[PDB]
Amino acid sequence: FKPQPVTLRRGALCLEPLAEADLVELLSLAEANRQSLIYMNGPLRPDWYRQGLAEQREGQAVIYAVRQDHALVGTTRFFDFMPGLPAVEIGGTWLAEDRHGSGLNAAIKFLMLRQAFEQWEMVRVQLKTAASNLRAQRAIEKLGARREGQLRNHRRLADGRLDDSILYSITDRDWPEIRRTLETELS
Amino acid sequence: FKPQPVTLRRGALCLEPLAEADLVELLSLAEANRQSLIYMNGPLRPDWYRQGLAEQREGQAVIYAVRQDHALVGTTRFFDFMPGLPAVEIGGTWLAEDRHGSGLNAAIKFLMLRQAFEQWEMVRVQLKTAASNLRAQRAIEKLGARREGQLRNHRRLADGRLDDSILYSITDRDWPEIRRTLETELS
Ligand SMILES: CC(C)(COP(=O)(O)OP(=O)(O)OC[C@H]1O[C@@H](n2cnc3c(N)ncnc32)[C@H](O)[C@@H]1OP(=O)(O)O)[C@@H](O)C(=O)NCCC(=O)NCCS
Ligand SMILES: CC(C)(COP(=O)(O)OP(=O)(O)OC[C@H]1O[C@@H](n2cnc3c(N)ncnc32)[C@H](O)[C@@H]1OP(=O)(O)O)[C@@H](O)C(=O)NCCC(=O)NCCS
């Protein structure tokens, strides 16, 4: 098993790797949305996507810009690669507020899980948010991902104060019945 | 915190760093208790020890050979360091069959926990053992840790047969009480 960069695409949407070149149009975008992005410190400081781009060369993550032939509307990434299994996470996912409520997320998740399950041949896909990020929480739960539990004192917010973290999973068995409820709102 | 090699001791029990010369005695001792270790990936492969020695220099694990006065009696390690909080894992624990229920673990645990929580001023210590691993699950419950959740499809046993894991964690508010007992324990 290895994770090589891939470009994922469904209709109007295009998922490509975070190149250097994008950090700019990615950054001030984040500054437009400094309200919706407050449960994931590491927003407008562009040391974030360089940390982002870094991880890849180590082989640690595979990190994505989300687009509609631009404009970038946000970013997501695979990471926490566990090849014995194999398994991965999704996370570091955020989107211009205009894209919320719109099912863009759903489109992103479907392309990434299908890749993860049907192509990487994985058995577990992690997804964690914060105990206080109820928006992120329902989203994952609209995705049909089992809530394995909250991990007390697991993160600090954009204020440097502690928060517990929720943790979800979707096994290899889960994937057909996950895949197909996305293929539902998508219709 | 800085994860520096440290020697902790309690009576006839000296947990001291792992050096490359211990590894040959540790693979041996492991093949002895080959059956009592089936719920763990790694332990009969010398390079699973080497791997912790290596990440000792990368800062990702401090790694302990457990001795009973003089006999190399087991291993147990620290890992999954999250500094931004900070918080740690304990794991990689295994003792030769003969010292099970003979009270050595409790002591190997207090020692580290007291190090991880009073010296390291940590806020979260997490442990995970196998869903199929029933002794381990009682032993962690005897510490005072909270069962945070089953984690499906998350691990493999010596067979390689997939399995689930159980997250247990202890925060700092829970320490005082956990220290306490493990002093009641010993008293
Ligand atoms: C989460 C994010 C993708 C927004 O996604 P999204 O497109 O709005 O997801 P959805 O469109 O399905 O809607 C989210 C759900 O949360 C609901 N919701 C939003 N705010 C809510 C609130 N205070 N309370 C309760 N529910 C709320 C929404 O109403 C919606 O549920 P609904 O259909 O019942 O109305 C992103 O914008 C973000 O800012 N941070 C994510 C950080 C993270 O955790 N990343 C890792 C997870 S992959
Ligand atoms: C650690 C290990 C050596 C067990 O040793 P131990 O720590 O001495 O066990 P302890 O005596 O501490 O506690 C075990 C207790 O659970 C009980 N127990 C529960 N279910 C049991 C079972 N199926 N078989 C045996 N004992 C069981 C034991 O009787 C014992 O006494 P008590 O519960 O009545 O007081 C070993 O089983 C192992 O393989 N470890 C896996 C390590 C791992 O992955 N976890 C890492 C996180 S530390």
Author numbering:
A (entry chain B), B (entry chain A): 2 to 188
From the manuscript:
Because GNAT-Xre toxins are widespread in Pseudomonas species, which also have highly conserved Fur proteins, we also tested the binding between GNAT toxins and Fur proteins from P. jinjuensis and P. flexibilis. Based on these results, we conclude that the specific interactions between GNAT-Xre toxins and Fur proteins seem to be a common and novel bidirectional regulatory mechanism, indicating that Fur proteins play vital roles in bacterial iron uptake.
GCN5-related N-acetyltransferase (GNAT) toxin, with an acetyltransferase activity-dependent mechanism of translation inhibition, represents a relatively new and expanding family of type II TA toxins. We here describe a group of GNAT-Xre TA modules widely distributed among Pseudomonas species. It has been also demonstrated that the translational repression function of GNAT-type toxin depend on its acetyltransferase activity which transfers the acetyl group from acetyl coenzyme A (AcCoA) to the amine group of aa-tRNAs, subsequently resulting in the inhibition of translation.
